């Protein structure tokens, strides 16, 4: 079983490495086609695509009477996106946020704060319905103020959409092969733990945003990474968390929310009055290191 474990594992890495690049390249071409910013395409299409794991994970979890996993995976991802994902990207490719995007990040902050307050008692199904609607409004609002759309409306768009979709299939399949392969090596060597078994799928639903952002960062597409991080967090709260609430009340996790809010606050302040580069990225990483060392 270890043999096909090494197979699934390494193959997933290869599918993640190349899949992320194509997904980045395809998204970048679509944004130029739609005459919107890389932030927009990252906050919308890329975000939703790379948040599909969390949506399906917590829908299944809350349905299988494990709402702790549900809210845990949604919140955990949000912290990982800002901490690890955005942390590495800011260092690789620093970014200066224009004021059209600062307004968008401020909305993100207000959104999270809202989610944190109504979640103090936990998350009812009504809460999910509310958060899901704001998710929809945000998407439409993000598209329309990031829209300088003009055209009228063949072969150059087809190659773009193909590159994007296949790139997305690459990272989604590549990420779950990574987890399947790691799990298979983990039980064949008999080193399985039921909570580490959660930690690999926890980290697994963040592999898309991680690899995708690393690809965009190395092509100086920080604005795309930024939109991807902002969009994924909302998609985690307004989508993954929300859907989980429909099946069952999610228990309150105020410690992680407080962490998320602070990191979200820091994110806005850095974007509004400073930059998102090295020492900001280093700070994010540091906070992420502390978080994974002390949280529960
Ligand atoms: C519209 C965008 C708002 C963005 C955020 C602005 C600041 C927070 C504003 C109201 C917080 C919620 C007030 C009502 C809930 C208070 C807390 C509570 O414990 O109850 C939650 C309630 O049960 C859940 O249905
Ligand atoms: C070494 C890890 C696996 C890499 C798989 C892709 C290798 C691509 C090498 C260059 C040529 C690609 C085909 C050109 C027709
Ligand atoms: C940061 C990633 C930590 C977990 C292992 C990734 C191996 C590739
Ligand atoms: C005040 C809450 C009362 C809840 C009573 C039991 C049924 C809850 C059903 C939630 C359905 C959510 C459907 C989302 C599509
Ligand atoms: C604020 C950044 C996260 C701090 C976590 C402290 C342990 C909980
Ligand atoms: C170590 C973390 C240093 C973080 C510095 C943040 C402010 C940079 C100047 C603005
Ligand atoms: Sr994700
Ligand atoms: Sr509530």
From Swiss-Prot:
<dbReference type="Pfam" id="PF01699">
    <property type="entry name" value="Na_Ca_ex"/>
</dbReference>
<dbReference type="InterPro" id="IPR004481">
    <property type="entry name" value="K/Na/Ca-exchanger"/>
</dbReference>
<feature type="transmembrane region" description="Helical">
    <location>
        <begin position="106"/>
        <end position="126"/>
    </location>
</feature>
<comment type="similarity">
    <text>Belongs to the Ca(2+):cation antiporter (CaCA) (TC 2.A.19) family.</text>
</comment>
<dbReference type="GO" id="GO:0008273">
    <property type="term" value="F:calcium, potassium:sodium antiporter activity"/>
</dbReference>
<dbReference type="InterPro" id="IPR044880">
    <property type="entry name" value="NCX_ion-bd_dom_sf"/>
</dbReference>
<feature type="transmembrane region" description="Helical">
    <location>
        <begin position="159"/>
        <end position="179"/>
    </location>
</feature>
<dbReference type="GO" id="GO:0005262">
    <property type="term" value="F:calcium channel activity"/>
</dbReference>
<feature type="transmembrane region" description="Helical">
    <location>
        <begin position="39"/>
        <end position="59"/>
    </location>
</feature>
<feature type="transmembrane region" description="Helical">
    <location>
        <begin position="250"/>
        <end position="270"/>
    </location>
</feature>
<dbReference type="InterPro" id="IPR004837">
    <property type="entry name" value="NaCa_Exmemb"/>
</dbReference>
<feature type="transmembrane region" description="Helical">
    <location>
        <begin position="128"/>
        <end position="148"/>
    </location>
</feature>
<keyword id="KW-1003">Cell membrane</keyword>
<feature type="transmembrane region" description="Helical">
    <location>
        <begin position="195"/>
        <end position="215"/>
    </location>
</feature>
<feature type="transmembrane region" description="Helical">
    <location>
        <begin position="3"/>
        <end position="23"/>
    </location>
</feature>
<feature type="transmembrane region" description="Helical">
    <location>
        <begin position="77"/>
        <end position="97"/>
    </location>
</feature>
<protein>
    <recommendedName>
        <fullName>Uncharacterized membrane protein MJ0091</fullName>
    </recommendedName>
</protein>
<dbReference type="GO" id="GO:0006874">
    <property type="term" value="P:intracellular calcium ion homeostasis"/>
</dbReference>
<dbReference type="GO" id="GO:0070588">
    <property type="term" value="P:calcium ion transmembrane transport"/>
</dbReference>
<feature type="transmembrane region" description="Helical">
    <location>
        <begin position="223"/>
        <end position="243"/>
    </location>
</feature>
<keyword id="KW-0812">Transmembrane</keyword>
<dbReference type="GO" id="GO:0005886">
    <property type="term" value="C:plasma membrane"/>
</dbReference>
<keyword id="KW-0472">Membrane</keyword>
<keyword id="KW-1133">Transmembrane helix</keyword>
């Amino acid at each position: 079983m270890v043999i096909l474990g090494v197979g699934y594992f390494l193959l997933g890495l290869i599918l993640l490495y190349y899949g992320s690049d194509w997904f980045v390249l395809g998204s970048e071409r679509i944004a130029r086609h739609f005459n919107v910013s890389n932030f927009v395409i990252g906050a919308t299409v890329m975000a939703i695509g790379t948040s599909l794991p969390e949506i399906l994970t917590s829908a299944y979890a809350s349905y299988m009477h494990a709402p702790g996993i549900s809210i845990g995976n949604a919140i955990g991802s949000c912290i990982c996106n800002i901490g690890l994902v955005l942390g590495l990207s800011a260092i690789i490719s620093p970014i200066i946020v224009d004021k059209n995007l600062q307004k968008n990040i401020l909305v993100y902050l207000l959104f999270v704060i809202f989610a944190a307050v109504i979640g103090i008692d936990g998350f009812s199904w009504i809460d999910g319905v509310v958060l899901l609607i704001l998710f929809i409004i945000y998407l439409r609002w993000t598209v329309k103020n990031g829209s300088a759309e003009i055209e009228e409306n063949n072969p150059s768009v087809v190659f773009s959409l193909v590159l994007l979709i296949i790139g997305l299939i690459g990272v989604l399949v590549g990420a779950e092969l990574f987890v399947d392969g790691a799990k298979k090596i983990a039980l064949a060597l008999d080193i399985s733990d039921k909570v580490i078994g959660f930690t690999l799928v926890a980290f697994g639903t963040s592999l898309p945003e991680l690899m995708v952002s690393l690809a965009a960062a190395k092509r100086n597409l920080g604005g795309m990474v930024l939109g991807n991080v902002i969009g994924s967090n909302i998609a985690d709260i307004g989508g993954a968390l929300a859907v989980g609430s429909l099946f069952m009340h999610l228990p309150a996790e105020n410690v992680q929310m407080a962490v998320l809010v602070i990191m979200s606050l820091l994110l806005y302040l850095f974007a509004k009055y400073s930059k998102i580069g090295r020492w900001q990225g280093i700070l994010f990483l540091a906070l992420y290191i502390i978080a994974i060392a002390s949280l529960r």
